[PDB]
Design a protein around this ligand. Structure first.
Ligand SMILES: [Zn+2]
Ligand SMILES: [Zn+2]
Ligand SMILES: [Zn+2]
Lengths: 80, 175, 62, 105, 184
Protein backbone atom coordinates (compact mmCIF):
# COMPACT_ATOMS: atom_id res chain seq x y z
CA UNK A 1 0.00 0.00 0.00
CA UNK A 2 3.13 2.16 0.26
CA UNK A 3 6.74 2.03 -0.89
CA UNK A 4 8.32 -0.83 1.10
CA UNK A 5 10.55 -0.03 4.06
CA UNK A 6 13.30 -2.22 2.58
CA UNK A 7 13.91 -3.50 -0.93
CA UNK A 8 12.06 -6.79 -1.46
CA UNK A 9 15.11 -8.37 -3.10
CA UNK A 10 18.14 -7.44 -0.98
CA UNK A 11 16.76 -5.38 1.91
CA UNK A 12 18.38 -1.98 1.40
CA UNK A 13 16.59 0.69 3.49
CA UNK A 14 14.57 2.14 0.62
CA UNK A 15 11.77 3.35 2.90
CA UNK A 16 13.83 6.00 4.70
CA UNK A 17 14.16 7.88 1.39
CA UNK A 18 10.73 6.81 0.11
CA UNK A 19 8.49 9.71 1.14
CA UNK A 20 10.89 12.36 -0.15
CA UNK A 21 11.34 10.47 -3.42
CA UNK A 22 7.58 10.60 -3.82
CA UNK A 23 7.04 14.31 -3.31
CA UNK A 24 10.12 15.54 -5.18
CA UNK A 25 9.23 13.31 -8.14
CA UNK A 26 5.92 15.14 -8.50
CA UNK A 27 7.55 18.52 -9.11
CA UNK A 28 9.90 16.93 -11.62
CA UNK A 29 6.86 15.59 -13.46
CA UNK A 30 5.30 19.05 -13.22
CA UNK A 31 8.44 20.36 -14.91
CA UNK A 32 8.17 17.85 -17.77
CA UNK A 33 4.39 17.35 -17.93
CA UNK A 34 3.52 19.94 -20.56
CA UNK A 35 0.05 21.03 -21.71
CA UNK A 36 -1.28 17.53 -21.01
CA UNK A 37 -3.95 16.19 -18.67
CA UNK A 38 -2.52 14.25 -15.70
CA UNK A 39 -4.32 10.96 -16.36
CA UNK A 40 -2.99 11.06 -19.95
CA UNK A 41 0.68 11.24 -18.86
CA UNK A 42 1.42 7.54 -19.65
CA UNK A 43 0.04 8.08 -23.18
CA UNK A 44 1.82 11.30 -24.21
CA UNK A 45 4.26 9.47 -26.54
CA UNK A 46 6.62 12.46 -26.27
CA UNK A 47 7.79 12.37 -22.63
CA UNK A 48 11.36 11.73 -21.45
CA UNK A 49 10.84 11.54 -17.68
CA UNK A 50 14.07 10.12 -16.22
CA UNK A 51 14.49 9.67 -12.45
CA UNK A 52 18.11 8.46 -12.42
CA UNK A 53 19.61 11.68 -11.05
CA UNK A 54 16.88 12.10 -8.42
CA UNK A 55 17.49 8.65 -6.94
CA UNK A 56 21.25 9.24 -7.17
CA UNK A 57 20.88 12.50 -5.24
CA UNK A 58 18.86 10.58 -2.64
CA UNK A 59 22.00 8.53 -1.97
CA UNK A 60 20.42 5.23 -3.06
CA UNK A 61 22.98 3.08 -4.95
CA UNK A 62 22.69 2.00 -8.59
CA UNK A 63 21.13 -1.36 -7.73
CA UNK A 64 18.53 -2.61 -10.21
CA UNK A 65 16.19 -4.08 -7.58
CA UNK A 66 16.20 -1.08 -5.24
CA UNK A 67 15.44 1.50 -7.93
CA UNK A 68 12.87 -0.84 -9.50
CA UNK A 69 10.92 -1.15 -6.25
CA UNK A 70 11.32 2.54 -5.41
CA UNK A 71 9.99 3.69 -8.79
CA UNK A 72 7.33 1.10 -9.54
CA UNK A 73 5.59 0.65 -6.17
CA UNK A 74 1.99 1.84 -6.12
CA UNK A 75 0.67 4.03 -3.30
CA UNK A 76 -2.75 3.23 -1.85
CA UNK A 77 -3.28 6.84 -0.72
CA UNK A 78 -3.15 8.02 -4.35
CA UNK A 79 -5.91 5.68 -5.59
CA UNK A 80 -8.31 5.68 -2.61
CA UNK B 1 -34.00 -0.72 21.61
CA UNK B 2 -31.72 -3.64 20.73
CA UNK B 3 -33.20 -4.11 17.25
CA UNK B 4 -33.05 -0.37 16.56
CA UNK B 5 -29.41 -0.19 17.65
CA UNK B 6 -28.48 -3.26 15.60
CA UNK B 7 -30.14 -1.80 12.50
CA UNK B 8 -28.61 1.67 12.81
CA UNK B 9 -25.10 0.61 13.88
CA UNK B 10 -24.91 -1.40 10.63
CA UNK B 11 -26.03 1.56 8.50
CA UNK B 12 -23.05 3.12 6.66
CA UNK B 13 -24.81 6.46 7.11
CA UNK B 14 -24.39 6.07 10.88
CA UNK B 15 -20.68 5.27 10.54
CA UNK B 16 -20.12 8.26 8.25
CA UNK B 17 -21.94 10.63 10.61
CA UNK B 18 -19.94 9.13 13.49
CA UNK B 19 -16.68 9.76 11.63
CA UNK B 20 -17.69 13.38 11.04
CA UNK B 21 -18.53 13.70 14.74
CA UNK B 22 -15.16 12.16 15.64
CA UNK B 23 -13.25 14.63 13.46
CA UNK B 24 -14.27 17.67 15.53
CA UNK B 25 -14.43 15.80 18.84
CA UNK B 26 -18.17 15.53 19.49
CA UNK B 27 -17.68 11.84 20.34
CA UNK B 28 -14.54 10.01 21.57
CA UNK B 29 -12.12 8.74 18.94
CA UNK B 30 -12.39 5.21 20.35
CA UNK B 31 -15.44 3.07 19.74
CA UNK B 32 -17.70 2.62 22.79
CA UNK B 33 -16.65 0.02 25.34
CA UNK B 34 -19.72 0.27 27.62
CA UNK B 35 -23.44 0.68 26.86
CA UNK B 36 -23.38 4.22 28.28
CA UNK B 37 -20.76 5.30 25.72
CA UNK B 38 -22.81 3.67 22.95
CA UNK B 39 -25.93 5.54 24.10
CA UNK B 40 -24.01 8.83 24.19
CA UNK B 41 -22.63 8.20 20.69
CA UNK B 42 -26.14 7.44 19.43
CA UNK B 43 -27.52 10.61 21.02
CA UNK B 44 -24.77 12.76 19.52
CA UNK B 45 -24.84 11.21 16.04
CA UNK B 46 -28.51 10.46 15.35
CA UNK B 47 -29.59 13.41 17.50
CA UNK B 48 -32.39 11.48 19.23
CA UNK B 49 -32.45 8.95 22.04
CA UNK B 50 -33.37 5.42 20.88
CA UNK B 51 -36.34 5.54 23.26
CA UNK B 52 -37.59 8.79 21.70
CA UNK B 53 -36.76 7.68 18.15
CA UNK B 54 -39.56 5.10 18.44
CA UNK B 55 -42.01 7.71 19.79
CA UNK B 56 -41.79 10.54 17.25
CA UNK B 57 -41.40 9.86 13.21
CA UNK B 58 -38.41 11.51 11.47
CA UNK B 59 -34.91 10.09 11.35
CA UNK B 60 -32.80 12.18 9.14
CA UNK B 61 -33.75 15.53 10.26
CA UNK B 62 -31.36 15.70 13.16
CA UNK B 63 -28.34 13.69 12.18
CA UNK B 64 -25.05 15.26 13.11
CA UNK B 65 -24.10 18.34 11.24
CA UNK B 66 -20.45 19.23 11.32
CA UNK B 67 -19.40 21.95 13.61
CA UNK B 68 -17.02 23.89 11.47
CA UNK B 69 -18.88 25.41 8.59
CA UNK B 70 -16.03 26.32 6.27
CA UNK B 71 -16.63 28.44 3.22
CA UNK B 72 -17.32 26.18 0.35
CA UNK B 73 -17.45 29.10 -2.05
CA UNK B 74 -13.73 28.95 -2.20
CA UNK B 75 -14.32 25.55 -3.66
CA UNK B 76 -14.85 27.84 -6.62
CA UNK B 77 -11.21 27.07 -7.33
CA UNK B 78 -1.85 26.11 3.03
CA UNK B 79 -4.44 26.11 0.25
CA UNK B 80 -4.49 22.54 -1.09
CA UNK B 81 -5.01 20.70 2.20
CA UNK B 82 -7.73 23.24 3.01
CA UNK B 83 -9.26 22.41 -0.39
CA UNK B 84 -9.23 18.72 0.54
CA UNK B 85 -10.92 19.54 3.86
CA UNK B 86 -13.54 21.59 2.01
CA UNK B 87 -14.14 18.70 -0.40
CA UNK B 88 -14.70 16.29 2.49
CA UNK B 89 -16.97 18.66 4.41
CA UNK B 90 -19.06 19.56 1.36
CA UNK B 91 -19.36 15.87 0.47
CA UNK B 92 -20.78 15.22 3.94
CA UNK B 93 -23.11 18.23 3.78
CA UNK B 94 -24.40 17.29 0.32
CA UNK B 95 -24.92 13.65 1.34
CA UNK B 96 -26.89 14.82 4.37
CA UNK B 97 -28.97 17.09 2.13
CA UNK B 98 -29.61 14.17 -0.22
CA UNK B 99 -30.89 12.11 2.70
CA UNK B 100 -33.22 14.95 3.74
CA UNK B 101 -34.52 15.68 0.21
CA UNK B 102 -33.45 19.30 0.59
CA UNK B 103 -34.70 21.81 -2.02
CA UNK B 104 -32.26 23.12 -4.63
CA UNK B 105 -30.17 19.94 -4.56
CA UNK B 106 -29.43 18.72 -8.10
CA UNK B 107 -27.70 21.92 -9.24
CA UNK B 108 -25.46 22.02 -6.16
CA UNK B 109 -24.75 18.31 -6.67
CA UNK B 110 -23.62 18.97 -10.25
CA UNK B 111 -21.49 21.93 -9.15
CA UNK B 112 -19.77 19.88 -6.44
CA UNK B 113 -19.30 17.00 -8.89
CA UNK B 114 -17.43 19.36 -11.22
CA UNK B 115 -15.36 20.60 -8.28
CA UNK B 116 -14.53 17.04 -7.24
CA UNK B 117 -13.63 16.16 -10.83
CA UNK B 118 -11.09 19.00 -10.82
CA UNK B 119 -9.81 17.76 -7.45
CA UNK B 120 -9.56 14.26 -8.92
CA UNK B 121 -7.54 15.64 -11.82
CA UNK B 122 -5.12 17.10 -9.28
CA UNK B 123 -5.02 13.82 -7.34
CA UNK B 124 -4.30 11.89 -10.55
CA UNK B 125 -1.47 14.35 -11.17
CA UNK B 126 -0.16 13.32 -7.76
CA UNK B 127 -0.45 9.64 -8.79
CA UNK B 128 1.91 9.38 -11.79
CA UNK B 129 4.94 7.08 -11.78
CA UNK B 130 6.28 8.72 -14.94
CA UNK B 131 6.60 7.72 -18.58
CA UNK B 132 9.42 7.35 -21.09
CA UNK B 133 9.67 6.95 -24.86
CA UNK B 134 12.76 5.53 -26.56
CA UNK B 135 13.41 8.26 -29.12
CA UNK B 136 14.93 7.54 -32.52
CA UNK B 137 18.16 9.60 -32.64
CA UNK B 138 17.71 10.36 -36.35
CA UNK B 139 14.23 11.73 -35.64
CA UNK B 140 13.10 13.53 -32.50
CA UNK B 141 10.27 11.26 -31.38
CA UNK B 142 9.20 7.68 -30.73
CA UNK B 143 11.36 5.08 -32.45
CA UNK B 144 9.86 3.65 -35.64
CA UNK B 145 12.72 1.32 -36.59
CA UNK B 146 11.65 -2.32 -36.73
CA UNK B 147 13.08 -5.67 -37.80
CA UNK B 148 9.84 -6.64 -39.54
CA UNK B 149 9.66 -8.33 -42.93
CA UNK B 150 9.50 -6.03 -45.95
CA UNK B 151 8.35 -7.42 -49.29
CA UNK B 152 10.63 -7.03 -52.31
CA UNK B 153 10.31 -8.60 -55.76
CA UNK B 154 13.59 -10.43 -56.21
CA UNK B 155 14.92 -11.02 -59.74
CA UNK B 156 13.82 -14.28 -61.35
CA UNK B 157 17.49 -15.28 -61.70
CA UNK B 158 17.42 -16.24 -58.00
CA UNK B 159 14.96 -19.10 -58.63
CA UNK B 160 15.85 -20.22 -62.18
CA UNK B 161 19.05 -20.32 -64.21
CA UNK B 162 19.68 -19.24 -67.81
CA UNK B 163 18.18 -22.53 -69.08
CA UNK B 164 14.92 -22.22 -67.13
CA UNK B 165 15.64 -24.97 -64.62
CA UNK B 166 15.09 -24.38 -60.88
CA UNK B 167 18.05 -23.95 -58.57
CA UNK B 168 19.00 -26.73 -56.15
CA UNK B 169 21.48 -25.26 -53.67
CA UNK B 170 23.00 -28.50 -52.40
CA UNK B 171 26.79 -28.15 -52.69
CA UNK B 172 28.60 -26.71 -49.66
CA UNK B 173 31.80 -24.80 -50.48
CA UNK B 174 34.34 -24.50 -47.66
CA UNK B 175 37.39 -22.23 -47.76
CA UNK C 1 -9.50 12.37 -64.87
CA UNK C 2 -5.72 12.51 -65.24
CA UNK C 3 -5.82 9.03 -66.79
CA UNK C 4 -8.52 10.17 -69.23
CA UNK C 5 -6.59 13.32 -70.14
CA UNK C 6 -3.36 11.36 -70.60
CA UNK C 7 -5.12 8.90 -72.91
CA UNK C 8 -6.77 11.76 -74.82
CA UNK C 9 -3.38 13.43 -75.30
CA UNK C 10 -1.86 10.18 -76.60
CA UNK C 11 -4.67 9.76 -79.16
CA UNK C 12 -3.75 13.21 -80.52
CA UNK C 13 -0.18 12.13 -81.29
CA UNK C 14 1.36 14.05 -78.38
CA UNK C 15 4.66 12.63 -77.17
CA UNK C 16 4.66 13.78 -73.52
CA UNK C 17 1.24 12.32 -72.75
CA UNK C 18 2.54 10.90 -69.45
CA UNK C 19 2.91 14.43 -68.06
CA UNK C 20 -0.89 14.71 -67.66
CA UNK C 21 -1.03 11.94 -65.04
CA UNK C 22 -0.95 12.64 -61.30
CA UNK C 23 0.15 10.30 -58.49
CA UNK C 24 -2.42 8.47 -56.40
CA UNK C 25 -2.68 9.64 -52.79
CA UNK C 26 -4.66 7.94 -50.03
CA UNK C 27 -4.37 9.24 -46.48
CA UNK C 28 -6.22 9.66 -43.20
CA UNK C 29 -7.11 13.06 -41.80
CA UNK C 30 -5.81 12.23 -38.31
CA UNK C 31 -2.92 14.64 -37.74
CA UNK C 32 -0.30 14.55 -34.96
CA UNK C 33 -1.85 17.76 -33.61
CA UNK C 34 -5.14 15.90 -33.09
CA UNK C 35 -3.32 13.30 -30.98
CA UNK C 36 -1.89 16.06 -28.77
CA UNK C 37 -5.37 17.60 -28.49
CA UNK C 38 -6.91 14.28 -27.42
CA UNK C 39 -4.36 13.99 -24.61
CA UNK C 40 -5.07 17.58 -23.52
CA UNK C 41 -8.80 16.83 -23.20
CA UNK C 42 -9.80 19.37 -25.87
CA UNK C 43 -10.64 16.73 -28.50
CA UNK C 44 -13.01 13.81 -27.92
CA UNK C 45 -14.35 10.99 -30.08
CA UNK C 46 -17.73 12.71 -30.50
CA UNK C 47 -16.22 15.73 -32.26
CA UNK C 48 -13.83 13.53 -34.23
CA UNK C 49 -16.95 11.86 -35.64
CA UNK C 50 -18.56 15.28 -36.17
CA UNK C 51 -15.59 16.39 -38.30
CA UNK C 52 -15.77 13.35 -40.58
CA UNK C 53 -12.51 11.84 -39.35
CA UNK C 54 -13.72 8.55 -37.85
CA UNK C 55 -16.98 6.63 -38.02
CA UNK C 56 -18.57 3.68 -36.25
CA UNK C 57 -18.43 0.36 -38.12
CA UNK C 58 -20.71 -2.67 -37.41
CA UNK C 59 -19.71 -6.27 -38.31
CA UNK C 60 -22.19 -6.50 -41.19
CA UNK C 61 -21.13 -3.02 -42.31
CA UNK C 62 -17.49 -4.13 -41.95
CA UNK D 1 -47.14 -25.55 -65.00
CA UNK D 2 -50.59 -24.86 -66.47
CA UNK D 3 -52.86 -22.29 -64.80
CA UNK D 4 -56.60 -22.84 -65.14
CA UNK D 5 -58.36 -20.14 -67.15
CA UNK D 6 -61.51 -20.34 -65.02
CA UNK D 7 -60.26 -20.36 -61.42
CA UNK D 8 -56.51 -19.63 -61.89
CA UNK D 9 -55.54 -22.82 -60.05
CA UNK D 10 -52.62 -25.18 -60.66
CA UNK D 11 -53.97 -27.85 -62.99
CA UNK D 12 -52.95 -31.50 -62.59
CA UNK D 13 -51.07 -33.03 -65.52
CA UNK D 14 -51.73 -36.61 -66.64
CA UNK D 15 -50.89 -38.57 -69.78
CA UNK D 16 -53.51 -40.22 -72.01
CA UNK D 17 -52.95 -42.02 -75.36
CA UNK D 18 -49.80 -40.12 -76.29
CA UNK D 19 -50.93 -36.67 -75.13
CA UNK D 20 -50.52 -34.43 -72.09
CA UNK D 21 -53.91 -33.55 -70.59
CA UNK D 22 -54.28 -30.99 -67.79
CA UNK D 23 -57.36 -31.45 -65.60
CA UNK D 24 -58.38 -29.03 -62.87
CA UNK D 25 -60.32 -29.40 -59.63
CA UNK D 26 -63.17 -27.38 -61.20
CA UNK D 27 -63.63 -29.83 -64.09
CA UNK D 28 -61.90 -27.68 -66.73
CA UNK D 29 -59.71 -29.83 -68.98
CA UNK D 30 -57.21 -28.55 -71.56
CA UNK D 31 -54.39 -30.15 -73.56
CA UNK D 32 -50.99 -28.54 -73.88
CA UNK D 33 -49.68 -27.99 -77.39
CA UNK D 34 -45.90 -27.50 -77.31
CA UNK D 35 -44.70 -25.58 -74.24
CA UNK D 36 -45.90 -28.17 -71.69
CA UNK D 37 -43.71 -31.04 -72.95
CA UNK D 38 -41.26 -30.63 -70.04
CA UNK D 39 -41.82 -33.29 -67.38
CA UNK D 40 -38.74 -32.43 -65.29
CA UNK D 41 -35.29 -30.90 -65.52
CA UNK D 42 -32.18 -30.33 -63.43
CA UNK D 43 -29.17 -28.03 -63.76
CA UNK D 44 -25.75 -29.05 -62.45
CA UNK D 45 -22.97 -26.79 -61.13
CA UNK D 46 -25.49 -24.16 -60.07
CA UNK D 47 -22.87 -22.68 -57.74
CA UNK D 48 -20.62 -21.43 -60.55
CA UNK D 49 -22.93 -20.64 -63.48
CA UNK D 50 -22.70 -17.27 -65.22
CA UNK D 51 -26.28 -16.35 -64.27
CA UNK D 52 -25.30 -16.71 -60.60
CA UNK D 53 -22.75 -13.89 -60.62
CA UNK D 54 -24.36 -11.49 -63.11
CA UNK D 55 -25.33 -8.98 -60.42
CA UNK D 56 -22.06 -9.47 -58.53
CA UNK D 57 -19.94 -9.12 -61.68
CA UNK D 58 -21.89 -5.98 -62.62
CA UNK D 59 -21.33 -4.48 -59.15
CA UNK D 60 -17.67 -5.55 -58.86
CA UNK D 61 -16.09 -2.36 -60.32
CA UNK D 62 -17.87 -0.25 -57.68
CA UNK D 63 -17.31 -2.52 -54.68
CA UNK D 64 -14.26 -1.11 -52.83
CA UNK D 65 -13.44 -4.48 -51.22
CA UNK D 66 -12.53 -6.22 -54.49
CA UNK D 67 -8.94 -6.90 -55.52
CA UNK D 68 -7.54 -4.48 -58.09
CA UNK D 69 -4.82 -5.15 -60.66
CA UNK D 70 -2.39 -2.87 -62.53
CA UNK D 71 -3.60 -3.39 -66.09
CA UNK D 72 -4.85 -0.92 -68.68
CA UNK D 73 -8.53 -1.02 -69.57
CA UNK D 74 -8.74 -1.22 -73.40
CA UNK D 75 -11.94 0.89 -73.48
CA UNK D 76 -11.41 3.94 -71.23
CA UNK D 77 -7.61 3.49 -70.92
CA UNK D 78 -7.84 3.53 -67.13
CA UNK D 79 -4.61 2.06 -65.77
CA UNK D 80 -6.22 -0.26 -63.19
CA UNK D 81 -8.77 -3.07 -63.43
CA UNK D 82 -10.82 -5.08 -60.94
CA UNK D 83 -9.82 -8.75 -60.80
CA UNK D 84 -12.27 -11.41 -59.61
CA UNK D 85 -11.78 -15.18 -59.31
CA UNK D 86 -15.04 -17.14 -59.43
CA UNK D 87 -15.85 -20.84 -59.59
CA UNK D 88 -14.13 -24.08 -58.70
CA UNK D 89 -11.96 -23.78 -61.82
CA UNK D 90 -10.83 -20.31 -60.64
CA UNK D 91 -12.03 -18.36 -63.66
CA UNK D 92 -10.39 -14.92 -63.68
CA UNK D 93 -12.46 -11.96 -64.89
CA UNK D 94 -11.20 -8.39 -65.26
CA UNK D 95 -13.90 -5.72 -65.02
CA UNK D 96 -13.98 -1.93 -65.15
CA UNK D 97 -16.47 0.80 -64.29
CA UNK D 98 -16.90 1.81 -67.94
CA UNK D 99 -18.56 -1.51 -68.81
CA UNK D 100 -15.49 -3.40 -70.04
CA UNK D 101 -15.35 -7.04 -68.98
CA UNK D 102 -12.86 -9.73 -69.97
CA UNK D 103 -14.23 -12.91 -71.65
CA UNK D 104 -15.95 -10.44 -74.07
CA UNK D 105 -19.22 -10.51 -72.10
CA UNK E 1 -31.21 15.01 -49.52
CA UNK E 2 -27.67 15.21 -50.88
CA UNK E 3 -24.52 15.88 -48.82
CA UNK E 4 -23.12 19.41 -48.88
CA UNK E 5 -20.10 19.56 -46.56
CA UNK E 6 -16.61 19.46 -48.06
CA UNK E 7 -13.26 18.81 -46.39
CA UNK E 8 -9.74 19.93 -47.20
CA UNK E 9 -7.93 18.13 -50.02
CA UNK E 10 -6.17 14.94 -48.94
CA UNK E 11 -2.89 16.12 -50.47
CA UNK E 12 -2.49 18.87 -47.83
CA UNK E 13 -2.81 16.57 -44.80
CA UNK E 14 0.54 16.19 -43.00
CA UNK E 15 0.66 12.77 -41.32
CA UNK E 16 4.25 11.77 -42.14
CA UNK E 17 5.16 12.66 -38.55
CA UNK E 18 2.76 10.21 -36.88
CA UNK E 19 3.87 7.26 -34.74
CA UNK E 20 2.11 4.16 -33.44
CA UNK E 21 2.39 5.53 -29.89
CA UNK E 22 0.53 8.62 -31.12
CA UNK E 23 -2.33 6.40 -32.34
CA UNK E 24 -2.85 5.15 -28.78
CA UNK E 25 -4.55 8.52 -28.21
CA UNK E 26 -7.29 7.30 -30.56
CA UNK E 27 -7.90 4.27 -28.32
CA UNK E 28 -7.81 6.57 -25.30
CA UNK E 29 -10.47 8.82 -26.83
CA UNK E 30 -12.61 5.84 -27.85
CA UNK E 31 -12.50 4.37 -24.35
CA UNK E 32 -13.16 7.75 -22.71
CA UNK E 33 -16.24 8.33 -24.87
CA UNK E 34 -17.46 4.74 -24.53
CA UNK E 35 -16.41 4.15 -20.96
CA UNK E 36 -15.86 0.53 -20.06
CA UNK E 37 -19.33 -0.68 -19.02
CA UNK E 38 -21.35 2.40 -19.93
CA UNK E 39 -23.62 0.29 -22.12
CA UNK E 40 -24.78 -1.65 -19.05
CA UNK E 41 -25.81 1.51 -17.21
CA UNK E 42 -27.49 2.94 -20.32
CA UNK E 43 -29.38 -0.32 -20.92
CA UNK E 44 -30.66 -0.48 -17.36
CA UNK E 45 -31.56 3.22 -17.48
CA UNK E 46 -33.69 2.94 -20.62
CA UNK E 47 -35.18 -0.27 -19.25
CA UNK E 48 -36.30 1.71 -16.18
CA UNK E 49 -37.42 4.96 -17.82
CA UNK E 50 -38.69 3.58 -21.14
CA UNK E 51 -38.82 -0.22 -21.25
CA UNK E 52 -40.91 -1.38 -18.30
CA UNK E 53 -43.49 1.46 -18.58
CA UNK E 54 -44.02 0.68 -22.27
CA UNK E 55 -44.25 -3.07 -21.63
CA UNK E 56 -46.80 -2.62 -18.85
CA UNK E 57 -48.89 0.06 -20.60
CA UNK E 58 -48.97 -1.65 -24.02
CA UNK E 59 -48.38 -5.40 -23.84
CA UNK E 60 -50.42 -6.29 -20.73
CA UNK E 61 -54.00 -5.38 -21.61
CA UNK E 62 -56.34 -8.02 -20.17
CA UNK E 63 -59.61 -8.99 -21.90
CA UNK E 64 -61.15 -12.26 -20.69
CA UNK E 65 -64.63 -13.76 -20.32
CA UNK E 66 -65.71 -16.20 -17.61
CA UNK E 67 -68.82 -18.31 -17.07
CA UNK E 68 -71.26 -17.21 -14.36
CA UNK E 69 -71.22 -20.23 -12.02
CA UNK E 70 -73.63 -18.87 -9.39
CA UNK E 71 -76.96 -20.31 -8.28
CA UNK E 72 -80.52 -19.27 -9.07
CA UNK E 73 -81.77 -15.68 -8.97
CA UNK E 74 -83.84 -13.29 -11.07
CA UNK E 75 -80.71 -11.69 -12.50
CA UNK E 76 -78.65 -14.80 -11.88
CA UNK E 77 -80.57 -17.36 -13.90
CA UNK E 78 -80.80 -14.78 -16.70
CA UNK E 79 -77.07 -14.09 -17.14
CA UNK E 80 -74.26 -16.35 -18.31
CA UNK E 81 -70.87 -14.62 -18.59
CA UNK E 82 -68.82 -11.77 -17.14
CA UNK E 83 -66.09 -9.99 -19.10
CA UNK E 84 -63.05 -8.86 -17.10
CA UNK E 85 -61.26 -6.02 -18.90
CA UNK E 86 -58.45 -3.90 -17.48
CA UNK E 87 -55.18 -2.18 -18.34
CA UNK E 88 -52.43 -0.35 -16.47
CA UNK E 89 -52.11 3.41 -16.96
CA UNK E 90 -49.37 4.85 -14.71
CA UNK E 91 -46.08 3.04 -14.01
CA UNK E 92 -42.97 4.11 -12.16
CA UNK E 93 -40.04 2.68 -10.20
CA UNK E 94 -38.39 4.39 -7.23
CA UNK E 95 -35.03 4.10 -5.50
CA UNK E 96 -34.58 1.21 -3.03
CA UNK E 97 -36.07 1.82 0.41
CA UNK E 98 -35.92 0.06 3.76
CA UNK E 99 -38.18 0.26 6.81
CA UNK E 100 -36.25 1.36 9.88
CA UNK E 101 -37.50 -0.13 13.15
CA UNK E 102 -41.21 -0.93 12.70
CA UNK E 103 -43.96 1.22 11.16
CA UNK E 104 -41.52 3.94 10.10
CA UNK E 105 -41.46 5.89 6.84
CA UNK E 106 -39.24 3.90 4.43
CA UNK E 107 -35.79 5.42 4.82
CA UNK E 108 -33.20 4.96 2.06
CA UNK E 109 -31.35 1.65 1.75
CA UNK E 110 -27.68 2.04 0.87
CA UNK E 111 -25.99 -0.79 -1.08
CA UNK E 112 -23.57 -1.69 1.72
CA UNK E 113 -26.43 -2.24 4.17
CA UNK E 114 -28.06 -4.55 1.62
CA UNK E 115 -24.80 -6.47 1.22
CA UNK E 116 -24.19 -6.81 4.97
CA UNK E 117 -27.75 -7.66 6.04
CA UNK E 118 -28.39 -9.95 3.07
CA UNK E 119 -31.18 -7.62 1.93
CA UNK E 120 -32.36 -6.94 -1.62
CA UNK E 121 -31.31 -3.78 -3.46
CA UNK E 122 -34.74 -3.44 -5.05
CA UNK E 123 -36.81 -0.34 -5.67
CA UNK E 124 -40.59 -0.19 -5.34
CA UNK E 125 -42.80 -0.32 -8.43
CA UNK E 126 -46.02 1.71 -8.40
CA UNK E 127 -48.83 0.96 -10.86
CA UNK E 128 -52.21 2.52 -11.61
CA UNK E 129 -55.06 0.99 -13.58
CA UNK E 130 -58.64 1.16 -14.78
CA UNK E 131 -60.87 -1.93 -14.75
CA UNK E 132 -64.02 -2.69 -16.76
CA UNK E 133 -66.35 -5.58 -15.89
CA UNK E 134 -69.02 -6.53 -18.43
CA UNK E 135 -71.73 -9.06 -17.54
CA UNK E 136 -73.80 -10.63 -20.33
CA UNK E 137 -77.46 -11.59 -19.87
CA UNK E 138 -79.36 -14.33 -21.68
CA UNK E 139 -81.83 -11.95 -23.35
CA UNK E 140 -79.08 -9.98 -25.07
CA UNK E 141 -78.32 -6.84 -23.08
CA UNK E 142 -75.19 -6.39 -20.98
CA UNK E 143 -74.11 -4.37 -17.94
CA UNK E 144 -70.79 -2.52 -17.70
CA UNK E 145 -69.11 -1.35 -14.48
CA UNK E 146 -65.97 0.79 -14.70
CA UNK E 147 -63.58 1.74 -11.90
CA UNK E 148 -60.33 3.71 -11.75
CA UNK E 149 -57.90 2.44 -9.11
CA UNK E 150 -55.49 4.80 -7.33
CA UNK E 151 -51.79 4.04 -7.81
CA UNK E 152 -50.32 1.46 -5.45
CA UNK E 153 -47.11 -0.48 -4.85
CA UNK E 154 -47.22 -4.02 -6.23
CA UNK E 155 -43.66 -5.23 -5.52
CA UNK E 156 -40.01 -4.20 -5.84
CA UNK E 157 -37.78 -4.55 -8.93
CA UNK E 158 -34.04 -5.24 -8.62
CA UNK E 159 -31.91 -2.14 -9.16
CA UNK E 160 -28.48 -2.13 -10.80
CA UNK E 161 -25.83 -0.44 -8.68
CA UNK E 162 -24.64 2.83 -10.20
CA UNK E 163 -27.71 3.28 -12.43
CA UNK E 164 -30.23 6.12 -12.26
CA UNK E 165 -32.30 4.34 -9.58
CA UNK E 166 -29.27 3.62 -7.38
CA UNK E 167 -28.48 5.70 -4.32
CA UNK E 168 -24.83 5.76 -5.41
CA UNK E 169 -25.81 8.14 -8.22
CA UNK E 170 -26.79 11.28 -6.26
CA UNK E 171 -23.54 11.05 -4.26
CA UNK E 172 -20.04 12.42 -4.77
CA UNK E 173 -16.94 10.26 -5.07
CA UNK E 174 -15.89 11.06 -1.49
CA UNK E 175 -19.35 10.18 -0.18
CA UNK E 176 -19.28 6.94 -2.18
CA UNK E 177 -15.84 6.17 -0.74
CA UNK E 178 -16.90 6.79 2.85
CA UNK E 179 -20.23 4.89 2.85
CA UNK E 180 -18.49 1.54 2.29
CA UNK E 181 -18.67 1.68 -1.51
CA UNK E 182 -15.81 1.49 -3.99
CA UNK E 183 -15.18 5.04 -5.30
CA UNK E 184 -13.22 3.74 -8.31
ZN1 LIG F 1 17.62 -3.99 -3.59
ZN1 LIG G 1 -59.96 -24.65 -62.57
ZN1 LIG H 1 -12.69 0.92 -68.45
Amino acid sequence: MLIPVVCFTCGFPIGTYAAIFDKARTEYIKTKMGGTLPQNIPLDASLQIELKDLITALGIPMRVCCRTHLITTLDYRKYY
Amino acid sequence: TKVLLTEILLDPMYDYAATVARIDGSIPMHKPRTPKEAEYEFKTVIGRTPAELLSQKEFYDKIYTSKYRPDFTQLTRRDEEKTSTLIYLRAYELFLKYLQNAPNFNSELAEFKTYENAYGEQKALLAQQGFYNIFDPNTGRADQRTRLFEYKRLPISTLYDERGLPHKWTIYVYK
Amino acid sequence: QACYKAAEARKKGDKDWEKHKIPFIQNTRFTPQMAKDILAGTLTLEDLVAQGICEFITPEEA
Amino acid sequence: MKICKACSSCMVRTYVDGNIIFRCSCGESVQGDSQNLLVSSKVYHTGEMEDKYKIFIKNAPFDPTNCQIKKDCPNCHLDYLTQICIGSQKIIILVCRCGYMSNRG
Amino acid sequence: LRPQITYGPIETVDNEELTEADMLSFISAAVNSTGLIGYNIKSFDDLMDNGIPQIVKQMFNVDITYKDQRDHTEIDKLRESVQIQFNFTDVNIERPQHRNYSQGNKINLLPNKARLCGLSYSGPVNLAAEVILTAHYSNGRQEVKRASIPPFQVSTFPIMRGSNRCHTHHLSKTAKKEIGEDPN
